[PDB]
From a paper:
Gram-negative bacteria use [name]-dependent transport to take up nutrients from the external environment, employing the Ton complex to import a variety of nutrients that are either scarce or too large to cross the outer membrane unaided. The Ton complex contains an inner-membrane motor (ExbBD) that generates force, as well as nutrient-specific transport proteins on the outer membrane. These two components are coupled by [name], which transmits the force from the inner to the outer membrane. Here, we identify a conserved motif within [name] that we term the D-box, which serves as an attachment point for [name].
Residue numbers in the entry:
A (entry chain P): 55 to 63
B (entry chain A): 61 to 134
C (entry chain B): 62 to 133
The structure:
């Protein structure tokens, strides 16, 4: 049950 | 479409844009902004002290609602 | 093959079962991925780990080019 994320900068 | 910023504060207060929300009201408030467009980018920001359990409760609410384009900001 | 990164309440960190810190994590990860940056990284943490800690780890992975992150 993962949640994908991007990190922004 | 225009990204939405979800903020969680150290007091665990939560906001969609400037609108106060809780787990039970967040998806209604978000749909007001996205008009239900699930491809809208959601940017999550939190106070440095917010813990992972809180983060995961918010992420799960968005995920079960079909909001899958999430960026973490810090 | 995906790699699991665990952060514990005391801020100790592991790649697989290998203890790591921010300055050694990418070497340890490259030993498992052979440098394949499309390898999925699953981040798991204790409930009390702070967002600051999560973001320090995410930034280290990000600056190294590991962009396929799942939170568990």
């Amino acid at each position: 049950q993962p949640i994908s994320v991007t990190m922004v900068t | 479409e225009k990204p939405v910023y979800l903020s969680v504060k150290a007091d665990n207060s939560m906001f969609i844009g400037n609108d106060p929300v809780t787990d039970e009201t967040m998806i209604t408030a978000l749909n007001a902004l996205t008009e239900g467009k699930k491809d809208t980018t959601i940017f999550f920001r939190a106070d440095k002290t917010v813990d992972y359990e809180t983060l995961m409760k918010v992420m799960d609410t968005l995920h079960q609602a079909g909001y899958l384009k999430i960026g973490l900001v810090g």
